[PDB]
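User: Structure tokens for this complex, please. No commentary.
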Amino acid sequence: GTLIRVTPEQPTHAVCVLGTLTQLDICSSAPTSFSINASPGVVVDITWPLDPGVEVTLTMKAASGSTGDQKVQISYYGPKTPPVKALLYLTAVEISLCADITRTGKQRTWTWGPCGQGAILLVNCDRDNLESSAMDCEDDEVLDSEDLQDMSLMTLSTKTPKDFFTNHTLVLHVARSEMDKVRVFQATCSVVLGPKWPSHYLMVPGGKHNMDFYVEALAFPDTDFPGLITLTISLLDTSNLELPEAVVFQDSVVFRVAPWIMTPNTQPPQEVYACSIFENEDFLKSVTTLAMKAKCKLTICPEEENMDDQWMQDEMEIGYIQAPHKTLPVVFDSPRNRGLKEFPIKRVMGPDFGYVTRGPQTGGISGLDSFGNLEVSPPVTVRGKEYPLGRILFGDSCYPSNDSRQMHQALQDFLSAQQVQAPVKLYSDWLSVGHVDEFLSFVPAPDRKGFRLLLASPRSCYKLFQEQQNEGHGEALLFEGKKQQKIKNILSNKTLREHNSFVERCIDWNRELLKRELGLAESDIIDIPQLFKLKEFSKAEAFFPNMVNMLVLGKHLGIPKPFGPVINGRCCLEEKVCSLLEPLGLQCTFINDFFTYHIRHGEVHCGTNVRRKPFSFKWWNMVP
Amino acid sequence: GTLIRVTPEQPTHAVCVLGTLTQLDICSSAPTSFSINASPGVVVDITWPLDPGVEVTLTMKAASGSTGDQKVQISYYGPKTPPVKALLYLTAVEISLCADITRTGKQRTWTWGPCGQGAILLVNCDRDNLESSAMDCEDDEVLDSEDLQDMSLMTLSTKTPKDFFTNHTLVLHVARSEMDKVRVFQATCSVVLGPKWPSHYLMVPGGKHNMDFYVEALAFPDTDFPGLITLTISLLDTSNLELPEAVVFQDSVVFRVAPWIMTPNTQPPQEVYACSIFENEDFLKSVTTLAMKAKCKLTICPEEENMDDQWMQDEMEIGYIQAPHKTLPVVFDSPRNRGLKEFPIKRVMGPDFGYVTRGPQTGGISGLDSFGNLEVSPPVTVRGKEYPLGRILFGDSCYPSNDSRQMHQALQDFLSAQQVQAPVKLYSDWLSVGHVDEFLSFVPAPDRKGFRLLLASPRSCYKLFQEQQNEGHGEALLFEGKKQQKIKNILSNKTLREHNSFVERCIDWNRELLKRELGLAESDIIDIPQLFKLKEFSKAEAFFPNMVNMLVLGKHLGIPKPFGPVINGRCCLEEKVCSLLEPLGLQCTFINDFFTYHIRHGEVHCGTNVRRKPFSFKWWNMVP
Ligand SMILES: *CC(=N)NCCC[C@H](NC(=O)c1ccccc1C(=O)O)C(N)=O
Ligand SMILES: *CC(=N)NCCC[C@H](NC(=O)c1ccccc1C(=O)O)C(N)=O
Ligand SMILES: [Ca+2]
Ligand SMILES: [Ca+2]
Ligand SMILES: [Ca+2]
Ligand SMILES: [Ca+2]
Ligand SMILES: [Ca+2]
Ligand SMILES: [Ca+2]
Ligand SMILES: [Ca+2]
Ligand SMILES: [Ca+2]
Ligand SMILES: [Ca+2]
Ligand SMILES: [Ca+2]
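Assistant:
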């Protein structure tokens, strides 16, 4: 809106911006009746009576060529009076601040969805600079023209009379609350807005001009940042030299900072990671083969950088950030800060590879803070609400006690603040190590919802063993090929069966948690045979290598080698698992991980990581 | 949900909680065809074939009298087989956690609105304890039974067999993220949940029992607290003595903490405040009269406690918090921390009087942080969105610069986090002092929307003076009854008219800001005649006492005495204002505030404060 106020005691000079509703105050200094005659470029909606209800409104069709080149004449006449005249001289200008608010690569509110509106900003948290230790956004400089591709275009367009900025100035600003979270460079780079600076006078020439800005974000959405940054242009009248500058017009663009998004096992793999370790050459060769079959590059951290840390699942999680103009992978580096600590910083973070961390870095850290305790489900629809990018899953206790553990609050808050994968707290504190990958995986399926949840299941392993004893193989030896144990003795062991009944309860609680939060039906779930035992603090560990803890590379599964009882040439555990999964068109390979991984309380999934293809569905089309 | 898993190789013992969907796993250990026969208290939905699609579901009608007193028999028969039988013994219990979730005084999601759902918690931030300096909630103790009335009732009801808690235990908990924000006392007080303690074992006897808890909140909604606290009961199986406790059932109540809410001038007054100061007796007498006419108690801070601080509008804002069971007023104490600093702490905070503060208390403080720069509009509906408790208004600059000021971020965030009065940033930085009460007030009206916005208006004062000169009074003296000035000289003064044109722009910008954000139409607005002048840093001060800066006590207005030009016995400024407002049925009194207040850059509204009647509309029925 804008009130132009007119008098007959003087002519008034005003500016109108195209797209704005200007209104005329005719009554406040009038002296009955009035008529309005305006130049041709000024259209007036509304031989008229001076009732204070009288709405007079002015609209311009085009930018002025010169100052005051449009004109409105208001005359106040009546019953026996010749006219008193009030003059108004207008200058019309275009001032459009544009960004990719339709989300194609190109209100001031941001809206979610396919019919929604608002531009997107990436946190510029990768490292396109050769030989540097810090993220691109840690400084107020654009060093490589490659770096501009990560940034979002914003354009100011002006159409004015040549002499217009003799008396007006334009300023760009961000609220002080948000200046720490955005940086803005003016294009022909040097910064115009940023953490040191919430506003800047633009240097624009009269006539027809177009000025490009490049915007990056410096922070992901989090507890104290919902994730919107508004940038505003204000047109100032600076024509009286004594008086302060007067604002004539503001306009704004609202951006939303892209969340950090995980990729489930159902997304096709692109790159694999693991460590080289002492006597581990045959584990590493086995993964290499599997990668080849699934078409993945492969990367190994060596014994020098490892610091003898083998658990490549735990220190990091590879995600992505996504904007219409640019999608890039970003690593979320766990505060667990073990031997693998540096590997996210030096080796993964890089050209088109983002970085992020959270949590206390000098410690105050559970094991539930390791990223074997961070998964995502596949996409899933739950009582009519779509989670098209899946729902994040992480382990916890059922309630908080003195003895209980949790993933650190700052990570919990970060994941939720991401919004787009509405986390779900599962129960994993019953496990010694405490990770959800210890009792669940997800695999692609050619039918139903296009996946299956695999849950570890003692019951199924009791059933198998019983079905083998029933068919005469009670003398068969677990751990054939450590102390061997026979199926008749495993089965009759009453205390082992109590432990496994209690693990069964823990897994079952989660089965139903996943059935409700994730929309699953029993035909979405397969049980993998798996025995556990309780050890220190009645916490659970795998009795034999945890098969459900597997590397999923599309259809090629790297499953820990259970070394089960060998019947008619084969491990019955291997055969049972193949019978459960081959009908889905999965290919099971069984990798020896026993003295290398299993005895140190982890398996194949725990010894490795995977980068996968980001979802084709665009996060901003969700309506969380 | 819950899977009971049955075998024919053993009978199983399970518990069912009333209101829960129990399901039976018949296939996992079956050995074709099955039938189900259950005791009379167990109803089974579902002479049946063993297809793994077969859904079997169990529902109980009532609490068990003894353990295992209901019974399910599953038999697996077939083509030539007599039955193998699997037994299941059930015990049914009631475990209901109840609170005032319908909001009358009496899903686990909280919902806004008249058809919404969820209990309400008050921050227990008043001081019902005699002789104490701290808020009730600063400690983990309930000292007065009066204090319980501020708290929210929550009840656990159990119906079990007598011997039930021999093998089960109940625990109450809050997530660790929220334990710093709630405290929970068990009733016959001593705490069961709180900032030191996120869980507690309840001591409940078998049979029919009912246990009351009293809940208070320790924190208002704010940037890092959306304002929901969930409390959960979990039923644990503790019958195997080696094994960890197993969760059998959780249920929860979600509370929402009440926001802090302001009251506009359109709400009827209840109590008035001001200071006793040096030569100010006649200001104080004038307010006293006005209070009496409007039926308000009256309170004065004396020269001893003042520390010579006269600005009773600035240090505090009296609001309220509201819950079905209890509504109480709460003072929001400004960080400006001037001479009035202690007055909120010692004199206002008290029995059924809450307290809150925000911002850096040792300074880093603008003048825009004073609470003359905090107002609320009346209730208002804006393009179809209702703000039934009004919208908070506070002053700012138009953009951020080196020289510009703002209300401190922590207050800004606090007000927004309150949600229910969606703040609006107005432009007041152009004023020397910098407060929105310097250019706007609101008054009750008997028509239209039931109020008017009054805006300071130089134009209207130029018009009046011109209309008086026109009728021959150019020689009339402003400041009659300091150096006097005549209407002909005020009018011809060209530099005074430039200042006032520039103030006109500043007020006009806000007029349209309020027209859009607040839904107003011109017939909602009255202009009060008011001249300003520009002084240090071209910042604006009142040329004569700022009339729009008035005390509104229902229909009785305490307006600063302008001491205008006296024409036919009367100040024309007084007469113009009376002509604008008497037709609304307002009663204007003009209070001398000139050497006492006006020359120290403030007026009557600035010398005073008011507590008013909280809205009848309940904040939780809004849908922000
Ligand atoms: C599935 C998963 N994410 N597993 C990670 C579990 C492995 C580590 N293990 C150890 O720290 C460990 C245990 C015994 C002996 C040596 C070591 C070691 O390599 O330091 C864990 N428990 O977090
Ligand atoms: C309308 C409103 N909220 N006004 C408050 C403005 C008053 C104070 N004034 C002073 O601090 C002041 C100015 C000059 C001489 C003495 C004093 C004084 O009492 O300390 C303000 N400017 O904030
Ligand atoms: Ca940079
Ligand atoms: Ca970059
Ligand atoms: Ca780390
Ligand atoms: Ca890049
Ligand atoms: Ca993971
Ligand atoms: Ca207390
Ligand atoms: Ca109390
Ligand atoms: Ca204070
Ligand atoms: Ca009280
Ligand atoms: Ca106020």
